[PDB]
Design a protein around this ligand. Structure first.
Ligand code: HEM
Length: 338
């Protein structure tokens, strides 16, 4: 590990995914229905829900709700496979093909469709968990193990196997170009990303907190998490953050549960590192979590985790049908009409 300090002894425990040898990829698919009122999205969401129960459906799927720009909401499925061939057979299923790639989105539709499908090579992937929790993304179906490789700047990079042999820099260098405003409503658009973009899903789960911890999380952490995500959304070029969403997770039936996450894409892992290590909003929430840890013998019922991947252009498929121009990758890079 390159960045680990001498005689490193972390204050808090943490766990990390330990992938079996036969696993080569994780498919992480984000599929969204975009609307101004959730009633408009009900029909699509019903169809997609049933598709996930196919024999080729994902090993795990979360539902979440995103409040986007200017009154648009995204109803999102976060779906995981451990076998790309199974994912491809799922997409090919006639029931999935009824709605895949926004097929039902007609002209002048009140809803949009988008999908961001990432096929993650395992050597370009790492996870971290504040507890031995088997309901955190891939930990629903991958074992996890205790690790010392955390609680220092650069630990995320060190946990990703390929960082020992690659700097993981963008071919575009250090500056994300100014966003542009696409005429994206009424169109079917595919965006091509540059190599070595970095995707993070970083999650907060207060479902097991008693009153004390819950009041602290809601009163003292979440407001600054909201501030952090807003800053990332509004300052793409300064930060290198292509896209950031704060989403609240839901039951199968759509009810909001006590879980959230930020899903963000960055021009490179280095951009994500520099924001995390430097910005005051992450400074503030990091400090509060360690304040909670000390007050609870370094075992809070609040659970945090993240999944971080570094992606090649060919690893990610980005499709936006009748979407608001601020959605996802639409402001950046190369676009084509499908
Ligand atoms: C916009 C939302 C967030 C982003 C993008 C983000 C990003 C990151 C990244 C990339 C790291 C790894 C740093 C490294 O290893 O170099 C990290 C570490 C950490 N973050 Fe966050 N984070 C976010 C929200 C939060 C929240 C809400 C909390 C607490 C409630 C939090 C607490 C921590 C802690 C405690 C660590 C240290 C983990 C360890 O290595 O043991 N973060 N964060």
């Amino acid at each position: 590990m390159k960045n680990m300090p001498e005689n490193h002894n972390p204050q808090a425990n943490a766990w990390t995914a330990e992938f079996p040898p036969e696993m080569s990829y994780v498919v992480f698919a984000q599929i969204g229905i975009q609307s101004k009122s959730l009633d408009h999205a009900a029909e699509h969401l019903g169809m997609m829900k049933k598709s996930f129960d196919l024999r080729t459906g994902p090993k795990h799927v979360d539902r979440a709700l995103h409040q986007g720009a200017d009154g648009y909401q995204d109803s999102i499925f976060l779906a995981y496979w451990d076998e790309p061939a199974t994912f491809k057979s799922w997409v090919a299923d006639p029931e999935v093909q009824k709605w895949w790639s926004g097929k039902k989105i007609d002209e002048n539709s009140p809803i949009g469709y988008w999908s961001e499908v990432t096929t993650i090579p395992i050597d370009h992937f790492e996870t971290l968990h504040s507890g031995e929790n088997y309901d955190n993304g891939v930990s629903h179906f991958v074992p996890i193990k205790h690790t010392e490789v955390h609680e220092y700047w650069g630990a995320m990079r060190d946990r990703m196997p390929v960082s020992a042999s690659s700097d993981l820099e963008s071919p575009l260098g250090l500056q994300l170009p100014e966003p542009i405003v696409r005429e994206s409503f009424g169109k079917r658009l595919k965006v091509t990303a540059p190599d070595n973009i970095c995707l993070i899903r970083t999650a907060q789960n207060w479902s097991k907190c008693g009153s004390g911890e819950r009041e602290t999380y809601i009163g003292l952490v979440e407001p600054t998490l909201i501030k952090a995500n807003t800053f990332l959304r509004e300052n793409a070029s300064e930060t290198g953050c292509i896209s950031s969403k704060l989403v609240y997770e839901q039951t199968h039936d759509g009810e909001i549960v006590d879980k959230s996450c930020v899903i963000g894409y960055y021009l490179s892992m280095g951009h994500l590192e520099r924001w995390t290590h430097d910005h005051p909003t992450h400074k503030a929430i990091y400090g509060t979590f360690y304040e909670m840890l000390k007050r609870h013998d370094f075992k809070t019922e609040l659970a945090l985790w993240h999944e971080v991947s570094v992606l090649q252009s060919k690893d990610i498929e980005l499709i936006y049908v009748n979407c608001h121009p601020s959605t996802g990758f639409l402001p950046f890079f190369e676009v084509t009409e499908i």
